[PDB]
Amino acid sequence: QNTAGCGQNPPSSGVKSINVGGMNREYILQLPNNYDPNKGHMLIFGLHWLSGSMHDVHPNYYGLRQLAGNNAIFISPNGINNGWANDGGRDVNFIDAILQQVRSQLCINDSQIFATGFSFGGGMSYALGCARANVFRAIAPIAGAQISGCSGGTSPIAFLGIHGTNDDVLPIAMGRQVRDRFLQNNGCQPKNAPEPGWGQGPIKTEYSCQPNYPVTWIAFSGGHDPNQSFVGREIWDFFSQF
Numbered sequence: 001q002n003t004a005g006c007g008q009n010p011p012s013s014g015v016k017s018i019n020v021g022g023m024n025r026e027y028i029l030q031l032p033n034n035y036d037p038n039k040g041h042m043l044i045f046g047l048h049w050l051s052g053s054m055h056d057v058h059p060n061y062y063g064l065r066q067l068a069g070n071n072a073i074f075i076s077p078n079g080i081n082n083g084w085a086n087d088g089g090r091d092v093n094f095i096d097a098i099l100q101q102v103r104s105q106l107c108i109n110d111s112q113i114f115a116t117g118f119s120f121g122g123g124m125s126y127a128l129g130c131a132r133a134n135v136f137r138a139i140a141p142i143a144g145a146q147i148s149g150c151s152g153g154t155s156p157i158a159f160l161g162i163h164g165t166n167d168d169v170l171p172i173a174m175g176r177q178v179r180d181r182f183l184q185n186n187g188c189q190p191k192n193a194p195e196p197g198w199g200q201g202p203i204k205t206e207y208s209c210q211p212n213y214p215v216t217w218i219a220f221s222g223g224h225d226p227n228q229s230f231v232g233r234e235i236w237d238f239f240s241q242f
C-alpha cells in the first residue's frame, strides 16, 4: 500500500537535516533519475561503517544504485561518532523520524522498505530487524554482528547475510549468530551451509523457511571488504523478489 506523499510535488535530492528529540541529525535523500510521484517506490536505507559517514555510502549504495533503475529511493543516514552505537535506541528513533518524514513527502510502497549496510552498518540493519520487523520487509547485513543492540528480535523478517571467511575484524562466527536468530524466527528447516575454501568462489545457501520470510547466507573467501562484485547483484535480487 502506498504512502500519503503519493501525488505530492517532490522535494529535491540532497542532504537533509531532521530534529530527533532535540538532536539535529542528517541524511542524504537520493531520488531516481525519473521520479513518478504517482508510483509507489522501494525505500532502501544504506548504512555506513565505523569511521565512515553518509558520504561514503552515497552515491553507489553498495552497488544497488546502478541496478535499481527508477524503482528505488535511497537514503544514507549519518551516524553519531561515525558509528551506529544506538545508545538506548537513539538510532532506531532516528530511522523512525526519517520514515515519518519521507513517507509524507514521497510515494513509497510500505511493503518495500529495506535496510543494508557493512560492518557497523550491518549491525545497525540487524538492530532494525530486531525492533522494527513490522516496518522493514528485509535486511541484508554485510559482515554484520550484534554490535548495535537488538531490542525485541523475536519477530520474523526476510534476511540475507553476507560474510567473508577470512574477516579478521568481525569474524564470520559473529555473522552466523545474526543469521541463526532469523533461522529460528522464520521457521527454517535445519540445513548445512558450506563456506568456501581459500581462493574459491562464494557459496550461497538458501534455506527452507515460512513462505514470506526467506533466509539466505552467502559466504565468500575474502576479508573485511564489502566491495565484492556479487554483493550489489545478490542484494538487489533478494530485495526485488518482494
Ligand SMILES: *[C@@H]1O[C@H](CO)[C@@H](O[C@@H]2O[C@H](CO)[C@@H](O)[C@H](O)[C@H]2NC(C)=O)[C@H](O)[C@H]1NC(C)=O
Residues within 6 Å of the ligand: 001, 002, 040, 109, 110, 111, 112, 242
Ligand atoms: C506494493 O508492493 C507489494 C509487494 O511487493 C505489491 O504486491 C505484489 O503485487 C504483484 C503483482 O503481480 C505480485 O508480485 C504480488 O501479488 C504482490 N507481492 C507481494 C504481496 O509480496 C503491490 O502491488 C505494490 N503496490 C501497492 C499499491 O500495494
Ligand SMILES: COc1cc(/C=C/C(=O)O)ccc1O
Residues within 6 Å of the ligand: 049, 050, 051, 118, 119, 120, 121, 147, 169
Ligand atoms: C568488535 O566490536 C565492535 C566492532 C565494531 C566495528 C565496526 C566497523 O568495523 O564498522 C564496532 C563496535 C564494536 O563493538
Ligand SMILES: [Mg+2]
Residues within 6 Å of the ligand: 068, 069, 070, 071
Ligand atoms: Mg525501472
